Swiss-Prot record:
Full protein stretch here: 113 to 250 of 250
Annotated protein name in UniProt: Galectin-3
Domain of life from the UniProt record: Eukaryota
Domain Galectin: 6-136
GO molecular function: carbohydrate binding; chemoattractant activity; disaccharide binding; IgE binding; laminin binding; molecular condensate scaffold activity; protein phosphatase binding; protein phosphatase inhibitor activity
Keyword Ligase belongs to the record: no
Amino acid sequence: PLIVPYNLPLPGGVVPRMLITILGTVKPNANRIALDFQRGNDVAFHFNPRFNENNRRVIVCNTKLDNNWGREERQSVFPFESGKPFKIQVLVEPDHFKVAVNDAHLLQYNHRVKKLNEISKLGISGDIDLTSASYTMI
Ligand SMILES: Cc1nc([C@@H]2O[C@H](CO)[C@H](O)[C@H](n3cc(-c4cc(F)c(Cl)c(F)c4)nn3)[C@H]2O)n(-c2cc(Cl)ccc2C(F)(F)F)n1
């Protein structure tokens, strides 16, 4: 087991062809999960499954600059399930982060923070038991 919130350093920042894989299990009474790719205090890519936003399950994605959240990108496809194991894969492509959950493509998030090699940490938080968090080049 890995302790949550967990920080995964991304040495030298992200680059296209970098694949991040996260394995965990959603807790039974889950409310929220967050992945935060950070550039110092800024959040280049926030990926945030919400299990009960006005009785809806939604994934909210956004960027935080100078402590301000920007325009949200919302996805109603919701592949997480309370109490169940999951795999998140985040592939850095030249123009977007590409996310798959349990081997099925979920969404893409266009790069708003363009200094990719300054996105040096990934935070993992929320209502999960975290099994593994790693990266490799494809
Ligand atoms: C109801 C709600 N939620 C938000 C924020 O939405 C952001 C995405 O647009 C982020 O999701 C933001 N957020 C979530 C979390 C968070 C913290 C945690 F510790 C965990 Cl474990 C987690 F899963 C998420 N921290 N910040 C969350 O507070 N709102 C918001 C959205 C925008 Cl675009 C601007 C301002 C806000 C507000 F937070 F209200 F000020 N409104």
